[PDB]
Amino acid sequence: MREIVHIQAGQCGNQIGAKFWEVISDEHGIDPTGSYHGDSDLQLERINVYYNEAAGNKYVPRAILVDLEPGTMDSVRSGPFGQIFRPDNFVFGQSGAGNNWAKGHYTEGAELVDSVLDVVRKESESCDCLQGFQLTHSLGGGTGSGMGTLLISKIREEYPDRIMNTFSVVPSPKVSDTVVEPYNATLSVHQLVENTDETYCIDNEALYDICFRTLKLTTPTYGDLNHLVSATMSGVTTCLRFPGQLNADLRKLAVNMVPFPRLHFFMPGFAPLTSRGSQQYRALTVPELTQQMFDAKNMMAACDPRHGRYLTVAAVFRGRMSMKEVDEQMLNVQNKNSSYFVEWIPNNVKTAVCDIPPRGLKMSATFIGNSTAIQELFKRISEQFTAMFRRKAFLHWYTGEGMDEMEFTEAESNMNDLVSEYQQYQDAT
Template sequence: MDSVRSGSLRQIFRPENFVFGHYTEGAELVDSILDVVQKEAESCDCLQGFQLTHSLGGGTGSGMGTLLISKIREEYLDRIMNTFSVVPSPKVSDTVVEPYNVTLSIHQLVENTDEIYYIDNEALYDICFRTLKLTTPTYGDLNHLVSATMNGVTTCFRFPGQLNADLRKLAVNMVTFPCLHFFMPDSAPALTVPELTQQVSDAKNMMAACDPRHGHYLTVAAVFHGWMSMKEVDEQMLNVHNKNSSYFVEWIPNNMAVTFIGNSTAIQELFKRISEQFTAMFRRKAFLHWYAAESNMNDLVSEYQQYQDAIAEEEEDFGEEAEEEA
């Protein structure tokens, strides 16, 4: 990635603009990409869904990525759409318009996806500093953490197991309300089962910079990879549930099954962080001419920011309801 950013390909088109990726250059390329997707889909014996990995900070991942998602959704309405979406952070990138790109992407992700695994660059950076003791993390270090998380999440799709779940089963168990399908993944290295269950529920290992203690889990799924006793796994997961029972909503029974995937109202912290960065820029109309030059973006950006705020408020409302019941 570093070589692409510094090489001759960096001038292909403006990489940090959602509008270029979604409405202009991306729209010209999407049909040829869909042809490849269709060929791959036709070669499948039993197509269950699609999995897309993209970043929300740049124009390609946010703009063209969400355009591709919407086009695939139109063609394959009954298939599961699953994304690993990397959320930007000022700690990693110096692109100032990232809050615009993320805000414009949220609406598309809510409407056209079934499962979203939010991976936060800020959390990845903190893990590199605090846990891995790296003084200057590279893109390779960050991508290694992302790949480890993706490997854990997709383990139950790729290998046999006693309690495996496919894409649809995971969505049915994890998504309690249609618009609240933003998951916080977590990962822990190879240790004993008690150590795994303890580390995997630790806020310091979350791949999204949100503290689950500030919200409530609607649902949780833990995916174990390796040789271990089912009895021991069940016992340890029960211990975790009992120890953290105050962080689970009471009106969804048996919401912990046996990498770690949490559907928590604490994800609102991520939305609020992006919203604050967005508001600070949008209030001054900073850099908005880059977007308005391609289309009438003032009203669209404002509308999408209201949509993002509404999602954050809905997450907060469910968290407050859970606190009142507790």
């Protein structure tokens, strides 16, 4: 029970799911065809939550693939794990969003949304009990910006109780791959702050850093760039899919963490990370997995916890392990970094211990962090917005789609409303 429906969008977020469902394939023994080959019977006991068991020894990914041009759908279906999906669910347009938020939200967003909302309805009717919806997209492109954000407001009109999480990549701090990355951020900020229950936020540059600092890689591909988020997403629900000594799921992570509904923008953390040969010369145990999390460099969002204040801390472990080896490590590290936290929460460290490791190393941990460090990135992004707005450039596209300045201004004000509230609890102690 408590099955989960998967929605994709954009062009970056599809290739992540093109790697993420490969992760879920070997976390359940799923072949590239769709059949079953696992040996551990703990997989089949909760197989239903990410897969419909179709007729005749089949398993299909309960996932909704959405694009606006036939290129990326062709690349998925031709490469690995493309025939595993259902051909009914390759629901995609023909135009391409043109790297415009307004094309993905107003003109071309209204076309394909009806084809999606039946498929959302067909899966939600077919599911016995529904847990929540998940979305993987961009905040820099066109299809990831407008099309995904247009869906979630229609879903909040449908379901009040169902949770919602977007693994949305933050627009980049210093490198500028997108020319109009403020215009794909700020118009996407307003949709995320209203009706997204929890929201995952990953910087681009730290993902380049973690693939270069700890691992010391020379030619990092997107098969190894985007792979770290694929293990990250699996560690969020790894206590759902298998029993544990202390289980967890998506509702336990929500109500523990989010202190007020406008403050729900989180940061990940994963451990352990080695090189190809520099992997045994380290005591890869709980205290090494302890101190690998809490440093500044492990955060996939490029932010310094020293230049900010936390609010809550979640931690999800994998593999069999003891407890006082964990618990004292999950207690003492709050005291060495004592002033970095905030006063008004006793024991803000949420612990979660599954009993199944990844297919690989013996123990693993997934960190879910929340701090006031992220608002300092938005002041750059609000500066990046206003630098392209104090001359009022790039308006005739949105004017051609039809939009006043006030929709730009209030969303920038609502971006500043995020500024006025993460600073508010940071100023408090």
